[PDB]
Amino acid sequence: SQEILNVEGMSCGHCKSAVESALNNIDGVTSADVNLENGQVSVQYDDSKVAVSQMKDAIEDQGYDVV
Amino acid sequence: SQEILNVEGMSCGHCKSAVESALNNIDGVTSADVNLENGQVSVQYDDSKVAVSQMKDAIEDQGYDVV
Ligand SMILES: [Cu+]
Ligand SMILES: [Cu+]
Ligand SMILES: [Cu+]
Ligand SMILES: [Cu+]
Ligand SMILES: [Mg+2]
Ligand SMILES: [Mg+2]
Ligand SMILES: [Mg+2]
């Protein structure tokens, strides 16, 4: 499954790495790709293992806003 | 001694942390304080031990531009 989340506050490569790392530490997330130019975060996942709510919380816990 | 560097590209707390760590790794740098709001980086150092050239290089090696 794929989810595209729109995120505010990611301003550089360090933010990209923080977000991708946080998402990839969740069991069930297969990969994550931040696009800093448009704020889009694309998550590939097993939808029997992880909910989108968990993705949003992981990102917000890193200090960003899911919009 | 005190040096103020003007640095472009620091966008967030991760950038701040990276710049301060790189500077504090240099022998003779006592402390470093990034102001993200104006790009100024204040470095306290022993001017017998460290040159400003070493500070600029450390910053530019982390990917930022020193003015
Ligand atoms: Cu950043
Ligand atoms: Cu950041
Ligand atoms: Cu940053
Ligand atoms: Cu950064
Ligand atoms: Mg969906
Ligand atoms: Mg993983
Ligand atoms: Mg030190």
For residue B36, the tally of other CB atoms under 10 A from its CB is 15
Method used to obtain the model: X-ray
**Helices then strands, each counted (H, E), chain B:** 2, 4
CATH of the domain at A55: 3.30.70.100
Helix-strand-coil percent breakdown of chain B, rounded to 5? 35, 35, 35
Torsion-angle region of residue B54: left (phi > 0), alpha (psi -120 to 50) or beta? Answer: alpha
**CB hemisphere CA count around B54 (13 angstroms):** 16
Residue B21 in contact with partner chain A when CB distance is under 8 A: no
Domain count, chain B: 1
**Measuring CA to CA, how many Å separate A24 from each of A17, A60, B24?**
10, 15, 31
The angle subtended at Cα A61 by Cα B36 and Cα B12, nearest 5°, is: 10
For residue A52, the tally of other CB atoms under 10 A from its CB is 14
Question: Containing H/E element for B43?
Answer: strand B40-45
- Tokens describing residue A58: 């992981």
Q: Which domain holds residue B38?
A: 1-67
Contact A12/A61 with Cβ under 8 angstroms? Answer: no
Nearest to B11 among A11, A18, A63 (CB): A11
Residue A36 in contact with partner chain B when CB distance is under 8 A: no
CA of A28 to the centre of ligand 4 (A): 28
Residue B25 in contact with partner chain A when CB distance is under 8 A: no
Closest chain B C-alpha to A12 CA, distance in angstroms:
7
